[PDB]
C-alpha cells in the first residue's frame, strides 16, 4: 500500500469520527424517546390495573356476601363433624410432615408444630365453609395491593427524576460541568428502580397453612365437607354452589391481576435497561468530547492494510487494517476484501468497527 494512500485514507477515516460524535448525541435522543414511550406504556398499564382492581374487589364482596348468606342460613351441623375432625387433624399433620421430609428436605418437626398449633385454633366449620380458599384470596389481595404500592413508589419516583433531566434543552470544552449533573441523575433514577414442588415448599415455609392443599389426601377431611347442616335444606347446596362459583370468579380475577403485575414488572425492568444504555451513552459522548479538544482533525491513522496476499495469516476474504485511534494502541479491523479501498465505505467501516473496540476497551 502506498504511503500517500494511507495518509489520505487516515484523513478520510478521521472525518467519520466527527460524524460519530453527532451520531452518539442522537443516540441519546433515541433512548430518551424510548424511555418516554415505555413510560407511557406503563401509564396505560396502570389504568388497566386500576380497573382490574375494582373488578377484583367487587368479586370479593360478592364472595363475602355468598359466604355470610351460608353462615346465616338457620340449622345446625351433626355432631359427627367433631368426630371426623379429631381423625382429620392427625392425618393432615402426618401428611404434610411426610411431604416436607420427602420433597422439601428440612425440619418436618417445626412444620408439624405450627400446623398442629393452627389445627387446634381452628374448627372443621372453617374447612366446610371453604375458609382456606377465602383466606387465601384475601392474602393474595394484600400482596397484590402491596406489590403495586412498591412498584408504583419506585417507578413514579424515578419517573420524576427523569422528568427533571429531560427538561434540559440538550434533549463545549467545559462539558464536565454538564457531565456530572446528568450522570448522577441517571444513577439516582437507576437505584430507585432496582428490586410446583419448589413453590409449595416455599409456601409451607411462609406459613403452615400451606399444608391445607393436601387435605385432599386425607379421607376424614374429605368427609367433613359433606355433613348436613342448615337442617338439610336445598338452599344449603344452592348457597354452597353459589359460594364455590363466586370464589372461582375472585380466583380467576386474582390471576389476571398477577399477569398485569408481571407485566408492570417487565415495564420496570425494560426501563432500567434503557437507563444503563443512557448511562453508557453519556460516558461515550464524554470520552468523545474529551478526545476532540483542539484544532487537530487527526483522530484515526491507518498503520498497515494487509490481506491473504501479503500477510497470509489473514483469512481468505478479509482485509486486516491496523489503525491508531485518539493516540492509543493499534487496532486491527477486518473489513471484507469485497470492499475496495477506493470505496468511501472502506474507511467508514474501519472507523465504525474501530470506534467500537475503543469504546469497549480503553479504560475511561
Ligand atoms: C392440640 O390438641 C391435642 C389434643 O388435646 C394435643 O395432643 C395432646 O398433646 C399432649 C402433649 O404432647 C399429650 O400429652 C396428649 O396426650 C395429647 N392428646 C391427644 C389426644 O393426642 C396437642 O398437643 C395440641 N396441639 C398443640 C398444643 O399445639
Ligand atoms: C356487595 O354486594 C351486595 C349485593 O350486590 C351489595 O348490596 C353491597 O352493597 C356490596 N358491597 C360493597 C362494599 O360493594
Ligand atoms: C345426624 O345423624 C343421625 C344418624 O344418622 C340422624 O339421625 C340425624 O337426623 C342427623 N342430623 C342431622 C342434622 O343431619
Ligand atoms: C398464616 O395464616 C394465618 C391464618 O390465615 C394468619 O392468621 C397468619 O397471619 C399467617 N401468617 C403469615 C406469616 O402469613
Ligand atoms: C421488555 O418487556 C417485554 C414484554 O413486555 C419483554 O418481552 C422484553 O424482553 C423486555 N425487555 C427487557 C430488556 O427487559
Ligand atoms: C474527561 O476529562 C476530565 C478531565 O481530565 C476527566 O476528569 C474525566 O474523567 C474525563 N471523562 C471521561 C469519560 O474520560
Residue numbers in the entry: 26 to 196, 212 to 213, 239 to 260, 280 to 448
Task: Paste lines from the article.
Clusterin (apolipoprotein J), a conserved glycoprotein abundant in blood and cerebrospinal fluid, functions as a molecular chaperone and apolipoprotein. Structure-based mutational analysis demonstrated that two disordered, hydrophobic peptide tails enable diverse activities. Resembling the substrate-binding regions of small heat-shock proteins, these sequences mediate clusterin’s chaperone function in suppressing amyloid-β, tau and α-synuclein aggregation.
Upon expression in the presence of the α-mannosidase I inhibitor kifunensine to generate uniform oligomannose N-glycans, purified Clu-Δ(214–238) crystallized at acidic pH in two distinct lattice types, crystal forms I and II, diffracting to 2.8-Å and 3.5-Å resolution, respectively. Crystal form I contained one copy of Clu-Δ(214–238) while crystal form II contained two independent copies. aData from two crystals were merged for processing of crystal form II. The three conformations in the crystal lattices differed slightly in their domain orientations, with root-mean-square deviation (r.m.s.d.) values of 1.5–2.0 Å (Cα positions). While the DD seems fairly rigid, its linkers to helices α2 and α10 deviate considerably between crystal forms, indicating structural plasticity. The N-glycans in Clu-Δ(214–238) point toward solvent channels in the crystal lattices and are partially ordered (gray spheres). These tails are generated by furin cleavage in the unstructured sequence of WT Clu that is deleted in Clu-Δ(214–238).
